[PDB]
Every structure is written in C-alpha cells, then in structure tokens.
Amino acid sequence: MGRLQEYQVIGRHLPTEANPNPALYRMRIFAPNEVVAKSRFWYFLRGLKKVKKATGEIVSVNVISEKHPLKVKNFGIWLRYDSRSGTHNMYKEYRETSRVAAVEAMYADMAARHRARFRSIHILKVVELEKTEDVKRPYIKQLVAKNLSFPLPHRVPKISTKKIFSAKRPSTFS
Amino acid sequence: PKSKRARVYHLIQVNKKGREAKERLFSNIRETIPKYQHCFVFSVDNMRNNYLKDVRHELNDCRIFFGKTKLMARALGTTPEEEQADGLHRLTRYLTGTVGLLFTNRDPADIESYFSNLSQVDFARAGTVAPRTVTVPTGIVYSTGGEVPPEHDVPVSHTLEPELRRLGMPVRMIKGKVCLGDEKGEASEGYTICKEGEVLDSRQTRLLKLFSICLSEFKVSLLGYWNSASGEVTELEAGKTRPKR
RNA sequence: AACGCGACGAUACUACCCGCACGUUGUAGACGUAUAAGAAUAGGCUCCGGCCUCGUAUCCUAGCAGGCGAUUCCUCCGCCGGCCUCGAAGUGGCCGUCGGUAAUUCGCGUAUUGCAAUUUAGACACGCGCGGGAUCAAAUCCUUUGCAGACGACUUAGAUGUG
RNA sequence: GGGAUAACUGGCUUGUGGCGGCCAAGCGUAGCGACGUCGCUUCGGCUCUUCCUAUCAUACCGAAGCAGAAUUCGGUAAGCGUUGGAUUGUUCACCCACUAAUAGGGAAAGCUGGGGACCGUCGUGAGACAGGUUA
RNA sequence: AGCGAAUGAACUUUAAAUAUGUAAGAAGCCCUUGUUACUUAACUGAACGUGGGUCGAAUGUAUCGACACUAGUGGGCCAUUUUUGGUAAGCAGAACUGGCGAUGCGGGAUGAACCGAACGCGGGGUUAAGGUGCCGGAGUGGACGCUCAUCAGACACCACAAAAGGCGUUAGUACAUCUUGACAGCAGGACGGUGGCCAUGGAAGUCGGAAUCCGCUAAGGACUGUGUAACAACUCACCUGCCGAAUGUACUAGCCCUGAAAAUGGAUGGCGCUCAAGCGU
RNA sequence: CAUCGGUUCUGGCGGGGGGAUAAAGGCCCAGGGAAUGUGGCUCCUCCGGGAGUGUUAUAGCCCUGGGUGUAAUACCCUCGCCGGGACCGAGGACCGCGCUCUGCAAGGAUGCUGGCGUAAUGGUCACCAGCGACCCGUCUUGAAACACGGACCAAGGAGUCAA
C-alpha cells in the first residue's frame, strides 16, 4: 500500500551491567517511511521477543533497493491474514519488477479479494522464483507462456473530460 | 467453483481396485513365467469374450492372462534390461491392443490345432459388417424376429416394448401383445434392422441381441509365442498383418 | 390541460396586407451564435488507389465599422420573378434579370476619440409614421324556447319567413 | 405513615413443547455444543369507503388407485364476489338452509343493547354516619 | 520468562499495561551545651535557648494569601471506561471523566445526546469535519481487483440468523487419483457352485428373516434399481478396449440470492447510477 | 500606468549535500550457467510450422568480481535568482536601527496621466433575482412537547411613602 521501500532495521536491548553486547536482532520491513519502519520493528519484536521500546535501541535503518529494477520477475509471497474465523496461510504469486511492487500489489489484492487490511496481514516470506516450473498459479503460468502475443479488443479511446460534445461517434478498434 | 454435477456415492459392496490389483497382476505373471515352457500371445479383436471362460476350463493345465495391455507388457519386460527371460521383450512387441497371454506346457502345434478348429457363433458388436439382412415380419412380433418359424416361437415379452421402441421399432401393445402395425399384419410393412454389407451400430446390435440373432463369429487368433528353452519368438499367420507396439 | 395543439369562417373602426423610417419599447443574455448521411464498435469508410486513436478538423476569414478611382477577374454573395419541390411543430433546388464582389497589383483618404473606458452595430416581438392596395363584422344585454335549470350556464327562436 | 416511580410497547409479531440421555463438525486442550432418536405427557350488534393476502369461490397449473363422476394436497394469482333466517329448549352458544362460496384482517371509529376521593366523629377481634368538602 | 536459578493467582531472579496516595528546603536538617517544676540510675533524654553550615528536579505563572461585608445558587438528562447484581431478552445500582444546561458557527438531506470548532465590525489567505455525476462549490480523477440483486448497494452492522439453505462467482487450505492412462463418455464383459438356508399358493440377487463363502478371475454384490405370478430381460457396482492431461472430495475467506411480510402513495434526501455515481485498499 | 512597502497564491532556473559516496544502466575485462534453446543438425511435415539434440555460432539471456567512476538520474534535505496575479497604503516636520552611501526598497504611498465635474459616484424607498431564516410571551421540566395569553389602535397601567 502507498509507496513502499524495503527497510533493514537492526535493533537491540539496551546494554545492562549483567548483559553487555546484546543480541542485535534484524528484520526486513515494508513501510512508507522510516518512522513507520521503526514502529513495525518494535511491534513485531514485542510479540516475538521480550524487548520493548523503552529498553530498546535502533542500531541502523537502511533502504534495500532492488538489484535489477529493469528485469521482469515472478514473485511468490507466503503470508498470513486473520479473519473473523482465525489466522490463515496463503501462498500467492505476483509478476512484477521489484519486491516493493510485488508487496504493494499483494496489499491491494488482499483488500480487494478478502477485505483484509494492513493491520491484519503478516508477510512471512517474499521470494523470487529463480526459474519457471516454480510457478504454480495458472494466471502467472499463462503470462510465462511461449511466444505470448495478444490483441487488445474493445479499446475505449481517451477523450478529455472537458470535451463534452463530439461531432463524430468514436471507434473502439485502435 | 460452484455449478458442478453431483457425483453419486453408490451404496455398493465392491470398490475400485487401483494400485493393489496392478501389483497383484505383476506378481501373478512374474511367478507364472518360470513354470511354463511356452508363452502364447493371442488376439480377440472385436469380440464379446464371454467364451474365454470355456477356454480356461478346456485348457486347465494352462494359464490365461487377460488384463491391461500396458500392465502385461511391462510385467513381461519391454526392454532387454528389465526383461525377465531371454527374448521376452520381443514378445511384448505383439502386445498392442485387446490381447491375452497363454502360458502352456504343450506342443505348440497342438495349440494351433485347438484354436483353429474352435468356432462359436456370437452376437455382432458394433463395427462388424452385416452378412445378412434381418427383417422383423409385419404383425405380431415374436421372441426371435422371424428366424425361428412363428409356429414354433412364442410372442415377445410385453415389458420389451419401451426398450424396442427406444431403439426405433414402431411397435404397440394390442391386447397385451406387442405388434408391428396390426395383429393381423396388414397395417404397415416390416422393420429392417440391418442391410447387406453395412456397418452396424450399437442400436442395431442391441436389437439383434434381444431377438437372440447371432450374426458374428467368436474365434481366437494366435499372433505368436515364445519358447523358454530357445528364448526365441516365432511368427504366426495372424501377426504379419497387425499393427505392432 | 379552464396558462396543450390543429384546421376553417367572418373580422366595423382601430388600422388588415405590402414597402421603408425610426423607436430615448421589451427580451434568463448575438458578436463567424457557420458545419444533416445511415449503421456497426469482436468493425467501418471509399473516388475501389486506399483510408480510420485524435473536430488541436472543414468552411469562411485582408479593405474609412471597411471610403474613392483604377489595374485585373468570371469567383462568391443578395433581391426579385418562372418551374418545381419541402407537412413530424412545413422549405430548399434549378434557371433568368439586376446589384455588389482583392484571385494579382497600385494611387489618393484616415491624424485631434489626444496613453484604456460595452468596438450603443444581431435576431425576434411590440409601437409610432408616411404611401400603395383591401374590407364594411360580430358577441352580449333584451324578448322567447324547455331537449335545460338552485342562480349562472345550456338547447332554441326573434330582420318578410315552411316566421 | 415514609422512600423510589406518571405507565407500557415500537425493524415488535407468525408453524412446528419442555426436561434428561446417546450421537455430534467444531471451539478448546475438562466445559459450550445443532439436526436426529430414545424416555414422560367489559362484551355483543350496526355500518359505509379503501387497502392487505395469510385465497372460501371463480381462471390456469403440479401431484395422488385420480377408471368416469366427485374430490384431496400443493403453486401463480386480490381481476371478480363472499347470503337469507334463527337467536323462541340445553350447552364447549350454533343450528336451518340457499349459494359458485357463504375466507381472514388493517385504517381503531362512533351509535346501540347487555352487563368517584379527602377530612371529621363514634367504634374497631368490625364497621357506622341525611357529618363536612371537592375535580 | 524460566524451572540447562531453587521451591511448587496461591513458584520466583526480574518484571508488564493501567490508573493512584504521600514528599521534594533557609516557613530546612543534624549536632551542641545552659536552664527547667517533665523524665532518667546519671548532665541523662524532651521542651525552652545559642552557634555552624550551590537556596538544592522539569515546565508554567494573565499574581498569592489573610480578614470583613454583599447578591444569585441547592436540580438533573445522556454517553465512555471500570465495577456489583439479574433476565429468555430487557435491565437496576455505584465511581471517574466528558457533553447539555448560560453557546452562536461548519458538516451528518432533517434533528436535545454525533464529528469539527468556539463568537466585536470588515478585507485577503489557509484549513478541519465532510465532500468533488446533477441538484451543489470542488474529479464522470488515477492504480489493482470484487459484485448483476424479480424494488442490489451506497456505513445501522444489533436482531431476524443457525453446526442454515444456493448445479452463483472469485481467491485459498488440506487430503486424494493420474502416460503403471486419472475425471467424463462410447463399445463390450458383469460368469460358476447356485432356483445358497428358512419361509411362502407362488418368491430363482431384487414381498420377507438370517448368514453372506468359495471358484474363474481382468472383474463381477449370495446383489443397487426397473421388471415377471415365478422366470426371463434390462440396469448399477466392478473390469477391459478406444480416447488423452489434468482431475476429485471436504473445508476456509470475500461479494451476490434466500434466510418472512401485512395493510392511504413514497423514498440510500431526490433524480438516477452496473469495467458504477456500488464494495476494499 | 510606473516605482515601492505589508500579506499571500502560483510558474520557471542556477548550485550544494546524503544514501550501497543511490540502486540501476552504456561501453570494456575475467569467469560460471541455463532455457520459454538462436544458429547448425535429424525426423515429421498441407502453403505454414512443429518435435528432438545441444550452450552462441548467422539472436540473445542469467549470475559473480573488476574498470570507466567521486558517471548520470530518481527520492530526501538544503543555498539562492528571475516571472505572473490578488488584497491592503494604517501614520503624518526631524529623531532610530541600518545599507549597496552625491544616496537608499532603512521607524506604514508616492510619481505621471485621462475622462467627468453632474445625479456621474453615492444614499433612501418599492420590486424582481440567488442564498439564508419556526410565532411571540408565560409556566413546567434535565429537556422538549402539551397547556395558558395574543382581532386591531390610542390613552392609563404596577418595588412608593413613613417609622
């Protein structure tokens, strides 16, 4: 959702006399900005571990940029969302150019198909399918077909919304 | 998604076999192979094969296998490496369609004599060419269809009228008797089931069976066999003109 | 439909029609108020060559608010007639006469509205004036009738007659 | 005699009982647990206009040993109708017929028959008063 | 959290969220020796005195306190959170805080209890809540999907309402079958002991009771339906050939239909809106 | 209209800094690999095109490291410079802070010009138009609602005096 970037967030518990040099945990977080990125770090850590914001410290926040934002890739996202019944696992595939593009599409798709919100979705794994034959979903499988070429029937032309009256009836062929 | 036909769960005693029967079929053939001296491959192309049971009784010292062609082919081994005995892979070349195996301890010429003198009359089955024209006489239809003389025949059962009419016979019940036209036999002409030299379909074949009219012949055609002693497969009359695997 | 519409008859004055002369007259609002195929949108148009996202197109578009005289041009515009065509709440075409007319190129004129002030300019309707043609009407009150009626309203009859 | 209180209901209502056991997908990690099955059983009359359908009849359909006739159960349907007497013996108030049938409700309504509350006095194991006042 | 620390909400090294009482200076703390009628065994304590040492957290401060006098006030309604008890469901009672009472203005079509925001007379700029298809100022704005309802939906999400009915549609989970040929189909087999035993006028797989085995097998039930007076005959289960690549079952999550409605004609505010002018981001 | 001051809306341009001293990318260097397998080869082939083999050839692609390289660009933050509008001009000798000093944009608008000099601006009424807008008082109540008073006008009409 929004515009997202991958964030490498490393945080630690505040060093005490008994426990110097703490564990230095790490996560990858999709957030619109660095303020949200740190909040998700402590929200996730408060669940998993017993480290809180008061006794915590953010070591580094870094942006992970996609290595090849010009290569078309197939992504597989393993996510968990909770509904009125419970928490469910689902695996879905997105054909995109960057991981942030894939995750943004997932948030839109989960909202459209299951009315799931950002607070309800946990992103467990996003992976680049290194090769075809790793694509399981038929909608992605048809896009990776050999010699793909399709027409675009019934294309509605773009007429300025301030051009109320047209002299000729438009055509929907090109 | 939705809008699918409902699969009926049959309240039945016998289920589908699947993998267990296949493995059982492999074991039965593989243990049979060492026990016999010859392995015959025979063909029953478009036959009803209800007489194969009588063949088993006559050949009680032999073993006949009539299963899936692919299962029987690889049970014998289709390549020299997975083959069980020498020359078996070239026997599997004969296994193409509806065929069977005949393990015997007999003289090979004895088997040819038995299966060449064996001949039984059976029903047609679709695809066969009609050797004669069959016509039901116009009038009171009998339980044979103008083959046994009517004086020696009995009228057809009245519960067969919907079944006969479904296959296309314009019959009617007149006072409890199925009739073609009128009981006197003057209202209409007869019914021609099959004509001379014409391929007959299941509609015509079914009509022949209820009238107990046999138009085809049951005969087993031997394609070739394999000698355990010599490990060499020979070629019999039928096989030279028949597609191979 | 008592604030929807059509056809027809007769309309005295007033001014009914025609022409032009204006209005210190009204307008939910001129300023180039320009532009007709039908049909489909998983198809269509054609000149039969080809063409189609796209009306950011086509037409018209110069001149003292648009003068005068030429040079040069048969192009465009307008009024009248004749023949026809237009009815869904009715018009355009063809021909002829006359008038105007940069497609090219000049000569004379513009000043002073003073450095901007709506560039008062169109169409319809209405009214006032002349000069040409044309016409000489009805309704109501009243008396009467009863096919009508609380009263109005209504069907009638009153001019010479089958009153 | 004192205290809290004007009073109730408004997506209300309708056709299938309660209790106990067995089974029971799940939730959960013992407890809740539906459908089935077993066990025990003020009132009446008078009305006109319109609306509703939860249809008694008339129209059309589906099914039933529905032979015919007559029906029964169900569906779409409110277009069209839904009576005259008794109420003079008994009761859970309801017989006589005629008719195609003699369905049920809402607008909730007016006529007509049936069938007061405070003090005062004298007493209270209990009432009496032509004693006073009043909306 | 652990019990690779001991012991076993009632265990603990440590320790949540959450409100909440008290205290934070020279109007202060301790020491000291003079007296005293108090006290002690005692110049010993206590009180009354003497002297000593950056004014001891942050933030704000539109002044604080004492005394006297004077007028209007003595109610409550609703909501959040916590909490006590109860009902079939309602509901009744406490504590705090907030809104209304003395309040105008913007929005929710309208309005005691909702959201925004508080007020001298004017000009300019920018916003909040709420909105930008037309009433109506501002988008027939952009991206990806979902949905077709015989009175959809447009923020009521409580009740009807369930472990509910849908051969509507989309996404997903688990299990299972498949070139050893899966699902669907077509062409054929579906046999023998055996009309198994009892019963029946009759009863042979198919009016009934009970057993339900073996052979041949590729497979075929002492039989799933039609049928006969009883047979016969057909059909199903199951098997094979042809065909050829993906299927089946059960659940979950969205949106859609039903999940009960009476009676003057009317309501997402109205027109109306379907790759929306509906739903999610 | 020109030059200013205050406030504000809205365009463009020139630099600086920071990430992985962006990530990518173009051109080179050295490795490795694969297919939705380019050529080549084989078999089917109906103009057409399929199936198979194998690693760049008569296309290319992926991954790793290095060079150009302190590359460019996006995003974030920053220093300035020009442009186009709108509203406003409070004060009235000097004084002050200042600067780019014959002076100035520095403690608040001046300069130049035009038409008109009268209903022209302006004001009062009545009306049309767009948006807005419950009928007052009393009483009760937490509040509404009910209830009570109100046909209209003129004059009179109610916290005074004494102790």
Curated annotation (Swiss-Prot), chain B:
It holds the Pfam family RL10P_insert. Keywords: Cytoplasm, Nucleus, Ribonucleoprotein, Ribosomal protein. GO terms for biological process: nuclear-transcribed mRNA catabolic process; ribosomal large subunit assembly; rRNA processing. One of its GO terms (molecular function) is RNA binding. It is found in: Nucleus, Nucleolus; Cytoplasm. The keyword Nucleus applies. Signal peptide: none annotated. Gene3D superfamilies: 3.30.70.1730, 3.90.105.20. GO terms for cellular component: cytoplasm; nucleolus; preribosome, large subunit precursor; ribosome. SUPFAM superfamilies: Ribosomal protein L10-like. InterPro entries: Mrt4, Ribosomal_uL10, Ribosomal_uL10-like_insert, Ribosomal_uL10-like_insert_sf, Ribosomal_uL10-like_sf, Ribosome_Assembly_uL10. Associates with the pre-60S ribosomal particle. Belongs to the universal ribosomal protein uL10 family. PANTHER family: MRNA TURNOVER PROTEIN 4 HOMOLOG (PTHR45841:SF1), MRNA TURNOVER PROTEIN 4 MRTO4 (PTHR45841). Component of the ribosome assembly machinery. Nuclear paralog of the ribosomal protein P0, it binds pre-60S subunits at an early stage of assembly in the nucleolus, and is replaced by P0 in cytoplasmic pre-60S subunits and mature 80S ribosomes. This is Large ribosomal subunit protein uL10.
